[PDB]
Amino acid sequence: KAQPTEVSSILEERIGVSDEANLNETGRVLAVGDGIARVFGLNNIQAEELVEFSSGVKGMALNLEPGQVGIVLFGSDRLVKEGELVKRTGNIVDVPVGPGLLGRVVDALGNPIDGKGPIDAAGRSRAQVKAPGILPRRSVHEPVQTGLKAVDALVPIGRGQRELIIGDRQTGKTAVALDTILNQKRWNNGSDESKKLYCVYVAVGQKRSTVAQLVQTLEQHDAMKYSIIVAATASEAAPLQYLAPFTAASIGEWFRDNGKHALIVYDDLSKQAVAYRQLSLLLRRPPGREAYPGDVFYLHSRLLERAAKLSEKEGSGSLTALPVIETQGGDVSAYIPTNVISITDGQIFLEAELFYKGIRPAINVGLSVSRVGSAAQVKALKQVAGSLKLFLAQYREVAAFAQFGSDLDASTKQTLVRGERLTQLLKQNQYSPLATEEQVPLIYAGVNGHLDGIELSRIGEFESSFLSYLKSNHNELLTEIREKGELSKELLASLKSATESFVAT
Amino acid sequence: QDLYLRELKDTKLAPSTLQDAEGNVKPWNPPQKPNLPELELQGPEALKAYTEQNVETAHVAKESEEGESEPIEEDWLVLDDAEETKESH
């Protein structure tokens, strides 16, 4: 209505700034080609200072020289014209942080693209913040319940444990962190903030239609009330795609330094490396391996180091990071991923053939591992999955061994049958997260060989059948697993009886 | 600031004949009144279904019954077939 004209006219009153508009920055643009611009003047400019051109496009002054300063653009060069007037902000590049960012969808600069008006920001924060030192940290001791079966079973995640999701094109990578965010609805509907866990998804270099459908889907399952989307789509400039994950990392630091717990998801760092080498080659800087500048390790390094678990002295904040790396044909020896593997605290490899067999999630257990996840696994899951990874590696040993058609003893054929049941067990449809109380009895049935008499095709209906069985009947045991997160011997035997009851069908 | 003031007064006033005083809209040749408050006042119910979805159909549940209250000619056949199944048991 006219209330937008009211708000815009109050902003016209601010437009008061003209009465104190004596900028000590303005200088002419010498040249501006190939995503860069040399500007004369600006003799009190700062290093990595945000400036704004006369055509409204902002920029970061990245390299300072006696004579000129090279400023990168934050958009197309079609708007910037030679010889114009370049006002400096007066600031190193900062972004809005605050709670009102939840639900909104912004650019790399916090300017919202959802069309939902301005941003209720609680402050501005620099992009290239130092990562915290070794002393205000703590080893992770709190779980991140992703809701997926084999993820929460085999590779548990601590609050702040930097875990890589690596895979290939169209291999179910995005759906993993997506359903993790959807699992976080359990406690974001709750009330304890230390149980709560806030979600920031960083879509860079991707299709705007894809991001729109993702935001749509997060509104359908109502994850949006705790979600923050950072869009750096492929139409936009390479420095925006370079810059945006640092900004979202600053947002995660805003949540972490408030004592709260937060989750950031990078998707993908691969295109960020493409944008960064696009920058560096347009900086005329020499490349190294696979035409990348040698600091690209330092790039994703200095990005991902700003994510850990704060100690109690800092208020016990945490920030967990989920990077995504698209590789080329299952290669794990390209220069870009081998850098990331040297940074993150573990790997979640998605084999293309397993999803080609429709096994979704397509987890290669033999490659995927976490380093310190076992310290923060759910204690019941830590009780019930000790033999599980051993048995699955055992079944993997006889997986390639059984292809020759040779008959075997009852031990290895037993492991073959039970590992087939466990393999067909851990499939899980999209948008179907599972609580820990739900994940425990499937593991307890899978360990104790009860699935062996069941048909291999019958396992999928058996899962939902036994779950609805327990939710109908042994709902008290579900509450016990919820409250304790730890199975006593009495809970163990009651669980055994409750299983073997429905195992009789 | 006569820049500011005259720009903002034209900014308020030239739509003020569109919103404050209902004088339609001098520059627009199509009218503004028979679009949103008249034609598309039924807009979301031209975007949804009228008279079943938006009237919402407070509908009585179709009453299903028990097995027609006949427990003779079927229970004794159940007992005879249960003799048969126990001869199979």
Add this chain to the structure above:
Amino acid sequence: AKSAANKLDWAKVISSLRITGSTATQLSSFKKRNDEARRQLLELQSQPTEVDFSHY
């Protein structure tokens, strides 16, 4: 309180081992589990069935 009924049901399953070929008694347990699972998801799915006059 239905857990005692289903405990009695599995007691009747391990005693229905004595009568193999129950045509519809196990199907009766199937139907009661079916609509019990239906009603529990129906009541958990149910909101306070109203339009929020204050906010919404």
Add this chain to the structure above:
Amino acid sequence: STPITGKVTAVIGAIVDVHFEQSELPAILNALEIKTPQGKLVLEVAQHLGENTVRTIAMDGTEGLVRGEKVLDTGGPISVPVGRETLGRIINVIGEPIDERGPIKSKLRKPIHADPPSFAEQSTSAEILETGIKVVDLLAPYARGGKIGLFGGAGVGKTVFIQELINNIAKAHGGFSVFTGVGERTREGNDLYREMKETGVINLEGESKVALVFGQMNEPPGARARVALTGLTIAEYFRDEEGQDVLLFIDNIFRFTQAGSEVSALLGRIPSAVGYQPTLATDMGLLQERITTTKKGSVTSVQAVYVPADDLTDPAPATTFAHLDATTVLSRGISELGIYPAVDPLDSKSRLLDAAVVGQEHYDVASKVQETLQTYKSLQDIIAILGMDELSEQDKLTVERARKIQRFLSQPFAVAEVFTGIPGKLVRLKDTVASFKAVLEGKYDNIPEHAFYMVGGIEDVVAKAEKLAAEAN
């Protein structure tokens, strides 16, 4: 009114440098004219080198040029004519008609470097573009406003396939087609244009249903890195003015990638990986995100992809595959079996082959079809080796079913009516779902395999069954 006269200072191949007078500098990406004796020569401001002097790239041949000539600036970017006048005209990248049917008397002209639509303007759920072809609408369904990677070399009726697509969109949705030959062989472009006249999608007097833009191979890379944007802007007009679903057909995206890499090479930029341009992701994203589904309508883009030296870790197909929502493979082996179209059922895949997208029924039908044909293809070894002896009644049923589908995938073409005489059928989606479902249930196992070759639908199944029964009697 204000002639911004520039002076030529440096001509290096396709690279032109112009010194202007003071405070007259055009922005980047603007058309510049030079009145040659042979017509006009077009330039495109790409690099402000300072000193009132900019660097453009050519749009045609740069022979015989004297440095210091008058350079005329157009101010804006390349205006290209849009509208009903553009249908059935052969247009260069400049915007000029080259079919020699006189000037295009279009009312509007649009700049080619428009921005992509905003994130707020994105339609938040991709429905299925109903094409009309059974196999496409069955196996790899197209997003309304999506990206389609067509594979396969020539000689497989790929042009016949895409003309059948043109007619099926014209009959079904009424939206139009814009074809764009980037680096198209000029002889083959001529044969294409002559065929499109002959198959009736171009009517020289009546309503041609399609607009053509042919950036030929003999044009400098500055042309061929903009022919795609020309066809893009033309399609964007018919979307955003007429509110339609308009189909942009592009060949080749890989020659476009070559053009962009050569443009970045001639501008003295350091080359990146594989010899491609360093701006490769951005040069792609400026093409892709201007192709979307608005609330006004959509532009659905089908574009051929040459796989370079049969490699998929090559960054140009690895970049293109980061945008293609659906693939379509014109194999030789399907055309080898006399099947029109030549679609491989197994490889042509979509990211929208999902039960929450096409409904559960269409998903389950396509699931059973892919499973049946996969088992059939696995059996095709021992079918030729051992015969139907090893087939159980589980197996020879499915073998017969997959034969019936494999004949039943074949569809008559409205463009192969001067070729085969059999008229094509705009086969609807809901007919196709139920037809393949009734084949998947086995309700026509009595019907012979031959009664399925080049048929429209299940009504045509029953009709051809009765006709072949009468001809056998």
Add this chain to the structure above:
Amino acid sequence: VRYEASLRQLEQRQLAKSVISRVQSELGNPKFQEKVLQQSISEIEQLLSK
């Protein structure tokens, strides 16, 4: 509520083409002449602040 937000956005885009109408109203004025004195007194106010 969906149509309410839709109507707000349609109101906003019709006021955007009304902003075009306001600019065309502002273009033909001797505010072009008078506003020079605006800048005059203004720059007096800014430079007399220091």
